[model samples]
Target chain A: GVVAAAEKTKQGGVLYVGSKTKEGVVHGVATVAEKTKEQVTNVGGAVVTGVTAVAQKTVEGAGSIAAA
Target chain B: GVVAAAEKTKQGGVLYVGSKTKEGVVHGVATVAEKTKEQVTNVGGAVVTGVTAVAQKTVEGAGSIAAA
Candidate 1:
């Protein structure tokens, strides 16, 4: 059978976040363990917002990002 | 039976970094393979920012986001 069953396992969640303004450019930043300041400036001079630390035990489940 | 099982794969980690503000809505940003300078500006006019990539080979049972 071409049908394959899924195997349950322990895992964490996935998160998505983005930024923007109304007219001109603003800033873009991502999470980094180190070198945050240098990276932010070198990358298109993005504004250095605060970094995040996410540790979720569960999530919305393996949702489909494609059309079913 | 409407029961369906789950499977595991080399899926990538979910990235979530938001601007946690106690006031009104703040700003947010995300990472993409694309340059994303325009997208960020278009969506809520985020401030034109660039994306930096990170690989979480063990994001789920792998290693620390740092080790990734």
Candidate 2:
């Protein structure tokens, strides 16, 4: 049931890395892939931070609910 | 540029939790939200672990190409 639903949205991660890599290349003094590495890692870090902050809120909310 | 592209895949995470939550209830020795917390959390942790590993591989691959 839900597993079938979850077997979805799978490739979005790959697309994110690809598009960000393209942008890094375009901004080149032309370090190319070198600069792209910076962008990809920056984006990856930002995303993880954003998601963690967001997830943390949910966890705390549920924590309170459980505690209550 | 890529920022606009990244504004894609927007709500997939919310959807995942909702479906997983529904499934948890169905597995009914039925702790309901408690069981669902288990699922949401396990899924979240697994996703982060995977993405970080992949990013390391991506970074490593870049390291290879830039030097070679």
Candidate 3:
């Protein structure tokens, strides 16, 4: 399971949790970019990044999304 | 000046500072998606998102970009 980073992005920006897998096929979800509001989920569930502190997400309070 | 946002996407993934343009015309730089590497800069400067805490950049150590 790997997650992207959230630095200078939007559309998929996270106020907390960015990606979470419960039971589904998430091919493309969440994106870190410029001036875009981070998406909450796509197929499974993910966010742009782990910033902003997205509370109502599968995860929460994650400021760093180290995809390593 | 206005900057972009950082989220789940890559090709512009930042461990800290995604974009930093002192002088340039950054048209298309990064894109947050399924599996990609977050770009550092382009013509001007930008990133996929902001959450990795990318240092050695124009910016660093700031999870909360808060576009607004």
Candidate 4:
């Protein structure tokens, strides 16, 4: 009944709780690197979309001014 | 070239840095919900895999003991 917690590490990386065998050997490491990469890509796409929209609006406004 | 940080928040949830338009309206939310869900799924899978392996070993060990 373990609910693992994930965190943002002091080194600016992601860390997830892990498990270990009875001999105290840790095992089953989840690939946080993959997860973090996914997060960056998701958020990056959102930011890019936002910036592109802003740029588009600015260009449209300039065209309106030039047309006048 | 902004490197956005993804964080597990005080609310025990994931939060991603977002963008805003020039008028101060936020836009293009990255849907951290999806990303966080993915992270949880990934970590959960790892934990399950570890537990299953441990269980299998325990069963095999018990069989050997009973055979002896």
Candidate 5:
């Protein structure tokens, strides 16, 4: 199973996780080279190189994201 | 100068610097699979993830790269 890195766009970045079974898909692509207060630049879901820490916090945070 | 991220070709990766002024352009591209003895993988203008410390060490190192 190989997940290829896609071209980055403001619209959204795509990622293909292993195991076509639970195939992971992340949407809502927005980017900001520079960060500002109260501005959370969504840089892919817990996969991108830098987003690893953020993902760890979000998915395994004290307050988990409630399912809608 | 809307710097765009290009395909990670042997040429190099691109990054947008924001304004139409002083466009940030990077060239001399290459990659590696495993760490070798001495090979520096340039990762854009010191602004890349997992490379800040390296930059600081390089630029502010006791030894300096003399401007040519």
Candidate 6:
């Protein structure tokens, strides 16, 4: 019954989806999984790029410190 | 400062956007306003259709009552 309810919410479309709570998260995941994959993927790529930039800075700082 | 902050968040794109709070809503509106206008427009049309259907049903019911 819980699974069924979750599935229903998941497929219930955007207005019904949310991430404010556990059930909401489930619905939101379903909505994203179905509808906005490309946009989300683009956003995820942007986050990764930012993290990668920070990582590069940290690594360069560590190397400079080691040289000093 | 508030307006500037709101504008920054609004233009900050999708992952930064949300509707969970005041700031979140501002960001969400900005992101959607720029990026996903077509999808939001479709969703808005669906909402109007559902609301219009309910209104028509109510009108028919009122007409039936008047005829009786």
Q: Where is model 6 more than 4 Å wrong at Cα?
A: A1-41, A44-46, A49-53, A57-68, B1-30, B34-36, B39-68
TM-score of each: 0.17, 0.13, 0.15, 0.15, 0.14, 0.12
In terms of docking quality, model 5 is: incorrect
Lowest lDDT block of 10, candidate 4 chain B: B59-68
- Candidate 4: tens digits of C-alpha lDDT, residues B1-68: 11111222232222233332233222222223333432222111111221112111111000000000
**For candidate 3, what is the DockQ-based docking class?**
incorrect
Model 2 chain A worst lDDT run, 10 consecutive residues? A59-68
Which stretches of candidate 2 lie above 4 Å from their native place?
A5-47, A50-68, B1-54, B58-68
After superposition, which runs of candidate 5 have C-alpha atoms over 4 Å from their true positions?
A: A1-38, A45-68, B10-68
Q: Report the candidate with higher lDDT, 2 versus 6.
A: 2
* Clashing pairs counted in every model: 20, 0, 60, 0, 2, 0
For model 3, how does the per-residue alpha-carbon lDDT over A1-68 read when each residue is reduced to its tens digit?
23433333333332222332223222212335454333332211123332211212132212333211
Report the candidate with higher lDDT, 2 versus 4: 4
For model 2, how does the per-residue alpha-carbon lDDT over B1-68 read when each residue is reduced to its tens digit? 11111111223312111111111111101111321221211111112221111212111000000110
lDDT (tens digit, per residue) of candidate 1 on A1-68: 11212232444446555433233332344433232222221121112333222223322122111010
DockQ of 5: 0.02
* Sort by TM-score, top down from the best: 1, 4, 3, 5, 2, 6
lDDT of 2 by residue, A1-55 (tens): 0111111122341121211111111110111122122221111111121111122
**lDDT of every model, 2 decimals:** 0.28, 0.15, 0.28, 0.20, 0.21, 0.14
Tell me the lDDT of model 3 at B51. 26
Chain A fold similarity by TM-score, each prediction: 0.19, 0.10, 0.14, 0.14, 0.16, 0.12
Candidate 6: tens digits of C-alpha lDDT, residues A2-44 = 0100000111101121223112111111112223323321111
Index of the highest-lDDT prediction: 1
B-chain TM-score for every candidate: 0.16, 0.12, 0.15, 0.14, 0.15, 0.12
What fraction of native interface contacts is shared by candidate 5?
A: 0.02
For model 6 chain A, the run of ten residues with the poorest summed lDDT: A59-68
| Candidate No. with top TM-score | 1
* Residue pairs in clash, model 5: A12-A29, B1-B20
